[PDB]
Structure 1
């Protein structure tokens, strides 16, 4: 409601999985300009940062009609058996061939720009000011074939998860959206004006009296007291503990495994995979069941109790559910 994002599905889209919303700016196109607040898929996103990449086979024993650096021809058969997509150069280990969308800037004198630097048209690449890069994108200084290829992705803030929303949430000057809505409110027709009342309500209270909205995103999870989540000696050797402790472990373990995954090195499929798990866990202790239901282990396919629902059970609709001293 506050952040104008499709209230329901636009969030679960970026929130729990990877559909990245372009946060500040992203110069390279999709066909159109930078989608200030719009969301894109990892497939098209992938198309946005490396550039374009399509590798293809060779029957046991055939030779390619193109050389090592001969720019692949837009719409050309690289080798007998395959038909490669448009912008590229042709590469090949002794089976398949590989296409690349960034243009080759052959250098013979040493390349001093380093792999990774953000580049804009002009940024030195190699052989002094002789080899200048004319397109926007990252740098890939290959030295087998002495060359400097410049990928076309300019820095596009594609981000997903509570990270993305935390940003968006800090950047809003509610007083702007207040005035902006006050006028969207009274002037246009009832369709877009109505939904604006609803959106002006939340923003009004945030500002009115009380606290500011950046806090809705959690980065520090409060832990309930211990004596309130006992560990006790039952009978014989049996120990009984508050369900909460099994959720807390989850969180703690995932949070830790996360850190260790960041430091060890970071294949990003693996970091998001866990950042998700982590999120789910952060939910679990708070409120279980609004999404997926946690179960310790076979014996009780019984939702582990959770803070949220402990409080509720207190005063909620049932005959007096758990009401009475």
Structure 2
């Protein structure tokens, strides 16, 4: 300040003072420490599978069996992403695929009462938080509320994916019945694989006593 007179000789955050007429500088380094899925996305998006490959090659021929082993079991996944031709940043999703309505049906039965899949309520309680958040990131709200609200997003999203691999599974209020997510349909005895693919009810059949 002072039209080119006083000048700080050290790094740090600058602080304006109207009362004491001073531009004070507080020692600090501008660092980008970002915490969250965003940062992880940054790293994954900047990764060089090729570099890490040729590096882990030299790393693997290390005489010690341990290091060699970890290097193997690493370059494994790396090579997977190589031969496949897929980018790891996709593992961090920006757009959540919504399943079609007839796949997640809601229909009324006799008596008039309705019915619905658990994945519907999941796919709903997701959008709620992802929305409120979008309003906050607009209207200028404090980092605490943001970091927490955004946390419930990363957990809700995952709840629509694998419900229960983290914490007590979300259930309809009042009931202890876990919500069935995408992964809940596939895996399992009665899942869409074992009950609706490798076996099924049929047509033109029947049974009786012998």
* Structures share fold, TM-score greater than 0.5: yes
Residue deviations 1:33-77 (CA, integer Å, cap 9, x gap): xxxxxxxxxxxxxxxxxxxxxxxxxxxxxxxxxxxxxxxxxxxxx
2: CA distance between counterparts of 1:164 and 1:268?
A: 16
5+ residue gaps, structure 2: 201-210
Count of paired positions: 200
Cα drift, residue 239 of structure 1: 1.1
Query: Compared with structure 1, are the counterparts of its residues 297 and 242 closer, same or farther at alpha carbon in structure 2 (3 Å cutoff)?
Result: closer
Is the 1:288–1:306 contact (alpha carbons within 8 Å) kept by the matching residues of 2?
yes
Compare relative contact order (CA 8 Å, sep 6+) and give the higher one, 1 or 2: 1
Query: Compared with structure 1, are the counterparts of its residues 235 and 209 closer, same or farther at alpha carbon in structure 2 (3 Å cutoff)?
Result: same
Is the 2:11–2:29 contact (alpha carbons within 8 Å) kept by the matching residues of 1?
yes
Cα drift, residue 237 of structure 1: 3.5
In angstroms, what is the RMSD of aligned CA positions? 2.3
Is the 2:118–2:180 contact (alpha carbons within 8 Å) kept by the matching residues of 1?
yes
Whose helix fraction is larger, Structure 1's or Structure 2's? 2
Cα drift, residue 198 of structure 1: 0.1
2: CA distance between counterparts of 1:236 and 1:264?
A: 46
1: CA distance between counterparts of 2:191 and 2:115?
A: 26
TM-score by length of 2: 0.87
Cα drift, residue 210 of structure 1: 3.8
TM-score by length of 1: 0.58
Is the 1:254–1:274 contact (alpha carbons within 8 Å) kept by the matching residues of 2?
yes
Is the 1:314–1:322 contact (alpha carbons within 8 Å) kept by the matching residues of 2?
no
Query: Compared with structure 1, are the counterparts of its residues 318 and 232 closer, same or farther at alpha carbon in structure 2 (3 Å cutoff)?
Result: closer
Is the 1:315–1:323 contact (alpha carbons within 8 Å) kept by the matching residues of 2?
no
Query: Compared with structure 1, are the counterparts of its residues 170 and 132 closer, same or farther at alpha carbon in structure 2 (3 Å cutoff)?
Result: same
Cα drift, residue 184 of structure 1: 0.6
Query: Compared with structure 1, are the counterparts of its residues 207 and 290 closer, same or farther at alpha carbon in structure 2 (3 Å cutoff)?
Result: same
Is the 2:119–2:160 contact (alpha carbons within 8 Å) kept by the matching residues of 1?
yes
Cα drift, residue 323 of structure 1: 5.5
Is the 2:129–2:152 contact (alpha carbons within 8 Å) kept by the matching residues of 1?
yes
Moved over 6 A (4+): 314-322
Residue deviations 1:243-273 (CA, integer Å, cap 9, x gap): 1111111110011000111111120011110
Query: Compared with structure 1, are the counterparts of its residues 195 and 294 closer, same or farther at alpha carbon in structure 2 (3 Å cutoff)?
Result: same
Is the 2:56–2:75 contact (alpha carbons within 8 Å) kept by the matching residues of 1?
yes
5+ residue gaps, structure 1: 1-125
Cα drift, residue 301 of structure 1: 0.7
Cα drift, residue 320 of structure 1: 6.4
Is the 1:286–1:306 contact (alpha carbons within 8 Å) kept by the matching residues of 2?
yes
Cα drift, residue 298 of structure 1: 3.7
2: CA distance between counterparts of 1:211 and 1:237?
A: 49
Is the 1:185–1:197 contact (alpha carbons within 8 Å) kept by the matching residues of 2?
yes
